Write a protein that holds these residues in place. Structure first.
Motif, PDB file in Angstrom:
ATOM      1  N   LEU A  10       6.128  17.499   6.367  1.00  0.00           N
ATOM      2  CA  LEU A  10       5.263  16.336   6.182  1.00  0.00           C
ATOM      3  C   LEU A  10       5.654  15.398   5.044  1.00  0.00           C
ATOM      4  CD1 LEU A  10       1.672  17.531   6.909  1.00  0.00           C
ATOM      5  CD2 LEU A  10       3.311  16.360   8.390  1.00  0.00           C
ATOM      6  N   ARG A  11       6.667  15.724   4.235  1.00  0.00           N
ATOM      7  CA  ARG A  11       6.938  14.892   3.063  1.00  0.00           C
ATOM      8  C   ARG A  11       7.292  13.471   3.464  1.00  0.00           C
ATOM      9  NH1 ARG A  11       7.041  19.877   0.869  1.00  0.00           N
ATOM     10  NH2 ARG A  11       6.223  19.647  -1.262  1.00  0.00           N
ATOM     11  N   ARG A  26     -11.035  19.612   1.199  1.00  0.00           N
ATOM     12  CA  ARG A  26     -10.193  20.778   1.460  1.00  0.00           C
ATOM     13  C   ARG A  26      -8.992  20.405   2.321  1.00  0.00           C
ATOM     14  NH1 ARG A  26     -15.728  23.202   3.064  1.00  0.00           N
ATOM     15  NH2 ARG A  26     -16.509  23.995   1.049  1.00  0.00           N
ATOM     16  N   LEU A  30      -4.738  20.450   1.221  1.00  0.00           N
ATOM     17  CA  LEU A  30      -3.663  21.097   1.966  1.00  0.00           C
ATOM     18  C   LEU A  30      -2.541  20.107   2.270  1.00  0.00           C
ATOM     19  CD1 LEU A  30      -3.251  23.957   2.765  1.00  0.00           C
ATOM     20  CD2 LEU A  30      -4.677  23.594   4.790  1.00  0.00           C
ATOM     21  N   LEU A  31      -2.907  18.901   2.717  1.00  0.00           N
ATOM     22  CA  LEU A  31      -1.906  17.941   3.159  1.00  0.00           C
ATOM     23  C   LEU A  31      -1.154  17.349   1.978  1.00  0.00           C
ATOM     24  CD1 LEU A  31      -3.353  18.356   5.914  1.00  0.00           C
ATOM     25  CD2 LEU A  31      -3.098  15.861   6.255  1.00  0.00           C
ATOM     26  N   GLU A  33      -0.564  19.162  -0.802  1.00  0.00           N
ATOM     27  CA  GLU A  33       0.332  20.277  -1.101  1.00  0.00           C
ATOM     28  C   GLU A  33       1.575  20.259  -0.211  1.00  0.00           C
ATOM     29  OE1 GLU A  33      -3.264  23.034  -2.193  1.00  0.00           O
ATOM     30  OE2 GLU A  33      -1.860  24.095  -0.881  1.00  0.00           O
ATOM     31  N   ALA A  34       1.447  19.785   1.035  1.00  0.00           N
ATOM     32  CA  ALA A  34       2.564  19.669   1.964  1.00  0.00           C
ATOM     33  C   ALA A  34       3.435  18.452   1.700  1.00  0.00           C
ATOM     34  CB  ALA A  34       2.054  19.606   3.414  1.00  0.00           C
ATOM     35  N   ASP A 118       0.703  31.289   1.679  1.00  0.00           N
ATOM     36  CA  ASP A 118       1.753  30.432   1.160  1.00  0.00           C
ATOM     37  C   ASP A 118       2.581  31.252   0.186  1.00  0.00           C
ATOM     38  OD1 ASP A 118       3.408  28.480   0.116  1.00  0.00           O
ATOM     39  OD2 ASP A 118       1.820  27.429  -0.967  1.00  0.00           O
TER      40      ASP A 118
ATOM     41  N   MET B   1       3.519  23.735  -0.614  1.00  0.00           N
ATOM     42  CA  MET B   1       4.228  24.425   0.457  1.00  0.00           C
ATOM     43  C   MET B   1       5.268  23.493   1.067  1.00  0.00           C
ATOM     44  SD  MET B   1       0.960  24.648   3.036  1.00  0.00           S
ATOM     45  CE  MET B   1       0.146  25.678   1.813  1.00  0.00           C
ATOM     46  N   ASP B   2       6.352  24.064   1.584  1.00  0.00           N
ATOM     47  CA  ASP B   2       7.408  23.211   2.096  1.00  0.00           C
ATOM     48  C   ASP B   2       7.115  22.762   3.529  1.00  0.00           C
ATOM     49  OD1 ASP B   2      10.325  22.153   2.322  1.00  0.00           O
ATOM     50  OD2 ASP B   2      10.283  23.767   3.806  1.00  0.00           O
ATOM     51  N   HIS B   3       6.346  23.546   4.285  1.00  0.00           N
ATOM     52  CA  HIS B   3       5.939  23.140   5.617  1.00  0.00           C
ATOM     53  C   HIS B   3       4.428  23.242   5.734  1.00  0.00           C
ATOM     54  CE1 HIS B   3      10.246  23.782   6.663  1.00  0.00           C
ATOM     55  NE2 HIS B   3       9.999  22.777   7.488  1.00  0.00           N
ATOM     56  N   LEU B   4       3.890  22.622   6.777  1.00  0.00           N
ATOM     57  CA  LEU B   4       2.473  22.727   7.115  1.00  0.00           C
ATOM     58  C   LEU B   4       2.354  23.364   8.486  1.00  0.00           C
ATOM     59  CD1 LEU B   4      -0.395  22.278   6.235  1.00  0.00           C
ATOM     60  CD2 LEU B   4      -0.494  20.373   7.880  1.00  0.00           C
ATOM     61  N   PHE B  99       7.350  14.444  16.241  1.00  0.00           N
ATOM     62  CA  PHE B  99       7.887  15.658  15.648  1.00  0.00           C
ATOM     63  C   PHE B  99       8.992  16.199  16.530  1.00  0.00           C
ATOM     64  CE2 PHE B  99       3.657  15.835  13.572  1.00  0.00           C
ATOM     65  CZ  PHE B  99       4.088  15.936  12.256  1.00  0.00           C
ATOM     66  N   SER B 110      11.795  17.503  11.777  1.00  0.00           N
ATOM     67  CA  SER B 110      10.443  17.401  11.257  1.00  0.00           C
ATOM     68  C   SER B 110       9.563  18.590  11.635  1.00  0.00           C
ATOM     69  CB  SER B 110       9.775  16.089  11.709  1.00  0.00           C
ATOM     70  OG  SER B 110      10.156  15.778  13.025  1.00  0.00           O
ATOM     71  N   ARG B 261      -9.596  29.137   0.427  1.00  0.00           N
ATOM     72  CA  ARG B 261      -9.417  27.691   0.420  1.00  0.00           C
ATOM     73  C   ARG B 261     -10.732  26.962   0.676  1.00  0.00           C
ATOM     74  NH1 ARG B 261      -4.265  26.080   0.701  1.00  0.00           N
ATOM     75  NH2 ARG B 261      -2.663  27.734   0.704  1.00  0.00           N
ATOM     76  N   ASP B 262     -11.626  27.554   1.468  1.00  0.00           N
ATOM     77  CA  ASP B 262     -12.875  26.898   1.826  1.00  0.00           C
ATOM     78  C   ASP B 262     -13.985  27.098   0.796  1.00  0.00           C
ATOM     79  OD1 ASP B 262     -11.710  25.887   4.156  1.00  0.00           O
ATOM     80  OD2 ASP B 262     -12.294  27.641   5.349  1.00  0.00           O
TER      81      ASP B 262
END
Ligand code: SAH
Ligand code: SAH
Ligand code: CL
Lengths: 447, 447
Positions: A10-11, A26, A30-31, A33-34, A118, B1-4, B99, B110, B261-262
């Motif tokens: 997603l970068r 929330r 997450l997004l 962090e991605a 993660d 994180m590197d991916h989602l 993607f 992607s 997370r929630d």
């Protein structure tokens, strides 16, 4: 297969969240962090969005849902409380072929967000298609307890080493056996974490040079006082990876059941056993090339006689490490409702045994909490000789037997009943002396 | 994180595979199983592709890469051996915000296709993003050994009871407790596995009939001294199921990564005690699971002896999870045991901020541990010397014990003033002869 799991890069890709409440917060976290480039559309925002915006981490569009914000988006998330708005978001994204999540209606969506562990670059994701969120969290919590969080750093060091591994181990079996050793080597993981480059290259070539058979190390693990739940995560991870577990009767049966069952068990305890041959068992097995775990009750460095073992190991070249445990004082304190320190009550806590000659002028002084390990035997000598030094006859005493277990018994009285209370219990028991004993009335929660 | 990670719904959505070989076959098989409207565009096809097109499960397009076939697509996969062609494909996908996966090139695409563990409708996905494919296989094969075969049936049945659960249980918490008992009933699992409907029904009706608790609770959880592996298994259960988590300065950032997370997070840090209590009190009075996360152990210099009466005075159930105290964490991680055969047979935990009884602290053959005595270090040195402790007694200062940023300085009691100026809070002062064991027991790194 109901859903295709994919791991999205997603970068600097445009993503849209519609919603500005805590649910949307929330999702936005997450997004971010991605590495997503994030726009948020909402009628209003909780203040955590305006701080992220001030720090230039997202973009805020205050207003009604505007379909044209999707115009160059890769992902859309409808995170509002209005099913009408979410359905307009969901419909606008479908016509643009943008994968869309609806937080409250996971069937309405073209994608679902799973529970995530993660350890990046290593990632694990769990979902059951919306049918069972609580099953996902149950599985996430077990996964979290098993995967050390430094696993990710080990992962990337691996990738930078696959050319050396492949150019040295001919067969793929040889290679898998090496990787299996690599990924559970803890001096390696700690050295990558602590950024000690001398210890990385040291451990690296010690991994390549020793035989594929050998993986000799000894880990001193505190089992804590009794309750299996009071083992540390590191402790549970170490006794899962072990080839041989050496244990005494102070380790509860429930801890032992957490030992994965192909490991060898060596019982070195009472029956009805000096420390010297215990040292040589550990020595022997490590120099055969086995991952030895020494499980001790409580904490290894608090009346463990656990230091004496390690200096023998240090003088043979056997790598070792130590995982602290909950000591008995801290476990019984919490499970009996007797805090060790408090307010005006106790400036200091004293852990002592019941060997040689002690100093009872010292032990008798006020504004203390006294915790006696292995004290049941010399217990009569303890009551008469605290009073014989001026300590008040009304000082509450308590004895916790089998602290933190389902067999815990607590007897409490006053210092002048200390002997009487004593052999209403048996070993293993703690003796706790001081004003803090008097707050068990208001603070005991263990049924 | 590197991916989602995301779980896509691919039913009735066009996807395009470029390539017609065995790698294209394995990706085609996956997209087919997910319900995709598949098109395969390649110069040549292995026989399984023509066997699929005869059954009308995909469209084959023979010939070189046609960019326009991307127009209606939600996913694209470049699976030719030709790396030039693969790049034209990932380029054509980029401009359209599709993607795209490139088989021989994880960093170039992607999205990544993960390893899957399938217990439909439950699914676990594992990836290391091409940095370590063998870590992903070792992990996938471990996960395969921890997920019961018939877990998918328990998840499927859960999906069919959600309408009923939501109709019969007003509140989110009541639903959670229902699901928590559902997913750990061994007998319901085996009954589903054996398609024994009357037994499923009998246990189901009884489960729906049980009185469900309606209380919130406050759990005091010890985070331990910093290292995330030093959390207890119980403490992890608590912060993975918590509704809100109230935490301090002295809870390390890696423990916070363990918080669900929630869950909502509330920070405290001069925020005095009477605001914490009423935050705790008001959140639990609403039926939420409240975790108070404190560094070290909550009952050792924790100030948590009065939080609990305010709750006991209110009728709020509460419990306590002990944590590793800073003393036993810093002991284990600096190579400094708190007790040892002939070095020290009693440990004293003291504070810093009548007053202290120095004649007692200066006594022979004990380990002194000072909590938050950094600002008072010159006084501690002065007082211990004046009450007879030898000038050359080893002392050590552990800063950030158990963290990646740990620092240890050490020396003799006449240096304690100067030493304190070399570290900052949070830090422990250890005084006693055990300090000298660090040169034989330090298995941790160089600061
Ligand atoms: N579960 C328990 N309940 C009460 N006392 C216990 C206990 N476990 C150990 N003890 C005490 O500890 C003594 C053994 S000395 C071993 C100490 C251990 N390493 C620790 O840190 O806790 C016993 O004689 C008993 O006094
Ligand atoms: N990781 C760490 N390393 C060194 N000292 C620490 C520490 N964490 C906490 N401390 C000490 O503990 C003090 C806070 S008092 C609370 C400590 C916690 N209740 C426990 O059981 O450990 C700090 O002033 C510092 O002296
Ligand atoms: Cl689910």
């Amino acid at each position: 297969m109901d859903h295709l799991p994919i791991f999205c890069q997603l970068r600097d890709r445009d993503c849209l969240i519609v919603g500005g409440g805590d649910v949307a917060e929330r999702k936005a976290r997450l997004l971010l962090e991605a590495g997503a480039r994030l726009t948020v559309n909402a009628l209003t925002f909780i203040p955590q969005f305006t701080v992220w915006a001030n720090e230039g981490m997202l973009t805020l569009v205050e207003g009604p849902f505007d379909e044209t914000l999707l115009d160059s988006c890769w992902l859309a998330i409808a995170a509002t409380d209005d099913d009408t708005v979410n359905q307009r978001v969901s419909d606008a994204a479908e016509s643009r072929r943008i994968f869309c999540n609806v937080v409250n209606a996971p069937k309405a969506a073209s994608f679902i967000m799973p529970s995530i562990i993660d350890r990046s670059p290593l990632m694990v994701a769990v979902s059951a298609g919306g049918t069972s969120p609580v099953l996902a969290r149950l599985l996430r919590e077990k996964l979290e307890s098993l995967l050390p969080q430094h696993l990710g750093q080990v992962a990337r060091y691996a990738g930078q080493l696959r050319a050396r591994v492949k150019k040295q181990f001919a067969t793929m079996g040889e290679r898998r056996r090496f990787w299996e050793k690599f990924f559970v080597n803890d001096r390696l993981a700690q050295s990558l974490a602590n950024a000690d480059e001398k210890a990385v290259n040291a451990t690296t070539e010690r991994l390549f040079s020793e035989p594929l058979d050998h993986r000799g190390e000894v880990v001193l693990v505190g089992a804590g006082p009794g309750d299996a739940g009071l083992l540390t995560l590191k402790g549970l991870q170490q006794i899962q990876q072990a080839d041989i577990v050496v244990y005494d009767r102070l380790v509860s049966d429930d801890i032992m059941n957490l030992v994965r069952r192909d490991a060898d068990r060596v019982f070195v305890g009472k029956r009805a056993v000096p420390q010297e041959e215990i040292n040589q068992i550990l020595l022997r097995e490590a120099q055969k090339g086995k991952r030895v775990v020494r499980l001790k009750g409580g904490d290894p460095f608090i009346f463990g006689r656990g230091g004496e073992e390690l200096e023998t190991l240090c003088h043979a070249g056997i790598p070792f490490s130590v995982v602290p445990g909950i000591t008995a004082a801290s476990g019984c304190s919490a499970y009996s409702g007797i805090p060790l320190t408090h307010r005006d009550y106790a400036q200091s806590v004293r852990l002592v045994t019941g060997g040689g000659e002690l100093d009872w002028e010292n032990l008798a002084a006020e504004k203390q909490t006294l915790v006696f390990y292995m004290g049941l035997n010399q217990a009569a000598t303890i009551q008469e000789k605290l009073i014989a030094f001026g300590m008040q006859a009304d000082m509450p005493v308590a004895l916790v037997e089998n602290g933190t277990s389902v067999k815990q018994r607590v007897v409490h009285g006053v210092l002048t009943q200390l002997g009487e209370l004593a052999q209403q219990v048996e070993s293993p028991a703690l003796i706790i002396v001081g004003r803090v004993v008097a707050l068990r009335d208001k603070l005991n929660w263990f049924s």
